[PDB]
């Protein structure tokens, strides 16, 4: 039902902010985008840029992904990202996360046509 593109958007795109507002951003957002449904996703990253800017990363620096595939792309500029890490206290279904804001280059895995991001690989 949901496409790879769509999933990327849902899990990682939060254009409606320039940075995780409070310190309870991950808890609210992780839960509201269904990343805590079957279990607590250990780590997640949201990107606080426009869709267009993130989808343009597929045209930038071609890098190897972590799994070995070579269709990964690193952003020229640095972007506003929020690292969401699961605490120790967290336990399904009460998922607890620590919000860690940062500005780094995002590495994404791109595919399909239009050639859009389908997976968030790394931030560097």
């Amino acid at each position: 039902k949901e496409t790879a593109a769509a999933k990327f958007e849902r899990q990682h795109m939060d254009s409606s902010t320039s940075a995780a507002s409070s310190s309870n951003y991950c808890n609210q957002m992780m839960k509201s985008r269904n990343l805590t449904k079957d279990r607590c996703k250990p780590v997640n990253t949201f990107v606080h840029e426009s869709l267009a800017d993130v989808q343009a990363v597929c045209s930038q620096k071609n890098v190897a992904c972590k799994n070995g595939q070579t269709n990964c792309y690193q952003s020229y500029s640095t972007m506003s990202i929020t690292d969401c890490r699961e605490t120790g206290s967290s336990k399904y279904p009460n998922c607890a996360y620590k919000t860690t804001q940062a500005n780094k280059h995002i590495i994404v895995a791109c595919e399909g046509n239009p050639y859009v991001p389908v997976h968030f690989d790394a931030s560097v």
Partner: nanobody
Amino acid sequence: QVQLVESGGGLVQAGGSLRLSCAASGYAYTYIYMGWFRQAPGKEREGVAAMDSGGGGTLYADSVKGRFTISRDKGKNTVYLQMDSLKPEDTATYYCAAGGYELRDRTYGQWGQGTQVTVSS
């Protein structure tokens, strides 16, 4: 604006040879993987051969192994396809592609416009 320009297409006799050329213009870095795909009239696009930017992680479709050779200028955005012992079956429009993985069609986001290669019985 990155263009992928291909050349070398032609019409040849069964058993003859052709050489396909492709260079990426306007790309600041080097695409790890560059390869060739082809689409026979009506049918679906299929991968022909691919190689990475270093010596190679070369890969060939089963129909062209031993007849076609791919090559890249080490560290550059160029791909070549020497096509020997061409056969009617090879008639198709060949496409150069960059920035993908192996022969995985969906992973390639930079596509040439296509070069017709026709081999007559």
